[PDB]
Amino acid sequence: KVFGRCELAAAMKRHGLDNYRGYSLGNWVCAAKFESNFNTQATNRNTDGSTDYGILQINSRWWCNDGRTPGSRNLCNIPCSALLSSDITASVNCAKKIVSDGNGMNAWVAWRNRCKGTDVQAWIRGCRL
Ligand SMILES: [Cl-]
Ligand SMILES: [Cl-]
Ligand SMILES: [Cl-]
Ligand code: NA
Ligand code: NA
Numbered sequence: 335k336v337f338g339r340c341e342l343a344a345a346m347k348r349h350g351l352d353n354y355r356g357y358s359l360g361n362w363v364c365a366a367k368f369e370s371n372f373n374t375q376a377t378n379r380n381t382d383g384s385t386d387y388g389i390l391q392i393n394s395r396w397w398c399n400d401g402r403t404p405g406s407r408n409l410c411n412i413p414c415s416a417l418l419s420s421d422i423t424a425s426v427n428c429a430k431k432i433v434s435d436g437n438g439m440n441a442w443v444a445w446r447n448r449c450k451g452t453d454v455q456a457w458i459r460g461c462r463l
Pocket of ligand 3: 355
């Protein structure tokens with residue numbers, strides 16, 4: 335599913351990501367834009383052999399099982415394929431774990447490099463939320 339911007343904002347808000355670990359909704363929407371262009375089916379191979387999955391490009395080295403990431407963990411207790419669903423619940427549950435792991439949203443390189451410190455409120459402009 336390719337979410338609209340406001341459509342994603344509303345779903346993330348409903349699932350409790352606004353202010354989660356102190357990160358305002360626009361941070362999450364910005365991260366999703368640059369991670370997946372709001373496409374739940376997005377995937378990305380990494381150089382280490384892990385893969386990133388879904389709306390927030392959650393990685394198989396620690397967070398989900400894909401059966402092809404040697405030595406990896408599955409801290410969200412999910413198949414990575416679940417991160418590709420049109421329903422973002424699994425991605426949100428897992429993102430909450432990730433952002434709680436110590437480095438906040440820096441865990442998303444795209445967020446640090448493209449969203450951090452920017453006008454993230456612009457991401458939710460116009461949305462009826
Ligand atoms: Cl915001
Ligand atoms: Cl694996
Ligand atoms: Cl933080
Ligand atoms: Na990524
Ligand atoms: Na894994």
